[PDB]
């Protein structure tokens, strides 16, 4: 009763102190400091490749570390690995559950993970002695739809599921090494830092959290959006990240400054972002939208520079290669474009 | 370069065999219809199913394979995992017409499903699963619907209504009042792309599959007619 009210008052006072400390160090806006740099111009990307082998809407894809092979999951119960150079398809893995919401390609290229509404993260071995692709593990520790999964090693995948928790897994044993909790609502996406010692996670409560993999504790919390956060990604240097929400705006948060640097938004766009990604140099932030086409923002002046098109349905998944050569865009029309 | 050429030759052979497999998978997949089946805890939707995160079920009628499924593994918040069902043939919405206290929530859920950007095309098959309990409750008369719906006091049974011969006209009035509430929520915004197909269902009805068959046939027929600029 009274103790709860006193605790709430103390928490509110501490939050006010945090806000005051945050605003004290807000010297000048990056829009102001960037007055001395020149605009990037007008990027004109064209559809270099069109991959068409999926029956239903493409909901996720992931590029390989070789910048040539990619994996794409579709809601028809299919997980196709494509060679982006020759348009050929190396593997076509039929999933147990049709409703798959994410997929991941191992950094070594040996295993491929997927997982959707079945609450389980399935892992498939590509380079088997028999030459076939078979299920090597089935991680079944989540109670809620599995929204994201990313490989940290060949045995240490990390998973985000729509039950306000993320789990650090150990594929060999098949059990959760560490469990991260603290999100108010369903968690939508996660992104790993280049050093992979810590990652960020965006959830459906207009908040993002920085998780230390080793410690397994909530390190930092960023709250700058107004609606559900649908996508998250790292800046290439790993000291900043970008979030894309359903209220038709993208934001850039810095782990050190604890502030939102850019609010990439326009008055003419009232469609939520579904996927974000950065370029190799960190100058171009690509972002899919509900308005059926992607946008390209300059990551320092917030001015839109270049617009992708040619997708019959909404853009769901977006990925830039490890060498920054091409960008692959999937959409709910079951076609995957490759631009460069 | 002979090794390289052999590499592309093997890759093209693998692509050809995988393409044959994908053609077979397409011919299998396009011949089945997916149905998102949802309701409430007291709805009794599990009773309609006459066979982890999804309780799947296949049934077949007139050589047509319907692919129905319940979603019970997730929490009550459903604004993110429901978009995944924007391509189903129909949405089977089950609700009990006996507990008036939990009927406004069902009306709100139906309205939210109806006026959704990604579900704006999917038509809804509405099931009222507790007709016998509703009839018994009305016959008892201890609970009054007007306590939860003040507009029921001035409601008249529609002329187009077709009550089963031998039932209480009060029960008929209650049934068609609930059905007309759902139907006005439906037609308030539906601009001819998706439709609502209410039905009156008990817990012992053995004709709950032909109804879904006929409703899906009508849905896809209207879809084709609209596609050919012929509606």
């Amino acid at each position, epitope marked *: 009763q009274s103790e709860l009210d006193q605790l709430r008052q103390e928490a509110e006072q501490l939050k006010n102190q945090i806000r005051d400390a945050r605003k004290a160090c807000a010297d000048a806006t990056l829009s102001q400091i960037t007055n001395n740099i020149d605009p990037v111009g007008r990027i004109q990307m064209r559809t270099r490749r069109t991959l068409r082998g999926h029956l239903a809407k493409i909901y996720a894809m992931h590029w390989g570390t070789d910048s040539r092979l990619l994996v794409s999951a579709s809601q028809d119960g299919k997980l196709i690995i494509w060679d982006s150079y020759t348009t050929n398809k190396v593997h076509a893995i039929p999933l147990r559950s049709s409703w798959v919401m994410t997929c991941a390609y191992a950094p070594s290229g040996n295993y491929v993970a997927c997982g959707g509404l079945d609450n389980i993260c399935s892992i498939y071995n590509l380079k088997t002695r028999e030459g076939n692709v078979r299920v090597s593990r089935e991680l079944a520790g989540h109670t809620g739809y599995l929204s994201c999964c990313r490989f940290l090693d060949d045995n240490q995948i990390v998973t985000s599921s729509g039950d306000t928790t993320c789990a650090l897994w150990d594929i060999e044993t098949g059990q959760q090494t560490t469990t991260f909790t603290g999100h*108010t*609502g369903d968690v939508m996406s996660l992104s790993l830092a280049p050093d992979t010692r810590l990652f960020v996670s965006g959830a*459906c*409560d*207009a*908040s993002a959290k920085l998780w230390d993999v080793r410690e397994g504790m909530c390190r930092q919390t960023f*709250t700058g959006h*107004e*609606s*559900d956060i649908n996508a998250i990604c790292f800046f290439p240097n790993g000291n900043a990240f970008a979030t894309g929400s*359903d*209220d*038709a705006t993208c934001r850039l948060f810095d782990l050190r400054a604890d502030q939102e640097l850019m609010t990439y938004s326009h008055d003419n766009i*009232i469609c*939520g972002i579904t996927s974000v990604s950065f370029s190799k140099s960190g100058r171009l932030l690509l972002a899919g939208y509900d308005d059926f086409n992607c946008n390209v923002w300059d990551a320092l002046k917030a001015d839109r520079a270049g617009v992708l098109a040619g997708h019959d349905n909404r853009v769901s998944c977006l990925g830039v290669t490890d060498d920054g050569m091409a960008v692959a865009t999937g959409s709910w029309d079951s076609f995957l474009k490759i631009w460069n | 370069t002979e090794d390289q050429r052999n590499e592309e030759k093997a890759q093209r052979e693998a692509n050809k065999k995988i393409e044959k497999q994908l053609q077979k998978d397409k011919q299998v997949y396009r011949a089945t219809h997916r149905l998102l089946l949802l309701g409430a805890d007291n709805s009794g939707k599990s009773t309609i199913v006459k066979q982890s995160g999804i309780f799947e079920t296949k049934f077949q009628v007139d050589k047509v394979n319907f692919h129905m499924f319940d979603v019970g593994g997730q*929490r*009550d*918040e*459903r*604004r993110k995992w429901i978009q995944c069902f924007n391509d189903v043939t129909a949405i089977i919405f089950v609700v009990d017409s006996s507990d008036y206290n939990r009927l*406004q*929530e069902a009306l*709100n859920l139906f*309205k*939210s*499903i*109806w*006026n*959704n*950007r990604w579900l704006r095309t999917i038509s809804v098959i509405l099931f009222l699963n507790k007709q016998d309990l509703l009839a018994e409750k009305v016959l008892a008369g201890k609970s009054k619907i007007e*306590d*939860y*719906f*003040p*507009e029921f006091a001035r409601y008249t049974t529609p002329e187009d209504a077709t009550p089963e011969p031998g039932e209480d006209p009060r029960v008929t009035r209650a049934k068609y009042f609930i059905r007309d509430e759902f139907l006005r929520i439906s037609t308030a*915004s539906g601009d001819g792309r998706h439709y609502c197909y209410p039905h009156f269902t008990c817990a012992v009805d053995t004709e709950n599959a032909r109804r879904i068959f006929n409703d899906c046939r009508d849905i896809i027929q209207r879809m084709h007619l609209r596609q050919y600029e012929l509606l």
Partner: nanobody, 128 residues
């Protein structure tokens, strides 16, 4: 950060009136459709009334139809619910939940047990 602060009243007599206010901050009020929900003691969360972005599409639940009035003031970024002729069943905790996505005619998953865009609530108690 999105926050919704509710300010109502305490104990009222049956048949009385009470005006609940809801101060919303952290988001563009005019783009979101506001809702009023309530949780009765020993009962789940239920929906009472809702107001559109402008206020042209008003709706109420049946049990509250004809007694409560909902109205939004976008200039001051606030919401109001006037309650008249209160019944003993009307005692509850009133939550001023806002809507997940803007520019949408249907507001979805509002009466959830755990909902992010919802206030701490205010207790309305009616008795003798």
């Amino acid at each position: 950060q999105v926050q919704l602060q509710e300010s109502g009243g305490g104990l009222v007599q049956p048949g009385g009136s009470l005006r609940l206010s809801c101060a919303a901050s952290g988001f563009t009020f005019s783009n979101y459709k506001m809702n009023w929900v309530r949780q009765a003691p020993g009962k789940g969360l239920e929906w009472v009334s809702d107001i559109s972005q402008s206020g042209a599409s008003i709706s109420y639940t049946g049990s509250v139809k004809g007694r409560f009035t909902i109205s939004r003031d976008n200039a001051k970024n606030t919401l109001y619910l006037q309650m008249n002729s209160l019944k003993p069943e009307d005692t509850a905790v009133y939550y001023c939940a806002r809507c997940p996505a803007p520019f949408t005619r249907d507001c979805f998953d509002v009466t959830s047990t755990t909902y992010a865009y919802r206030g701490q609530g205010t207790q309305v108690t009616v008795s003798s």
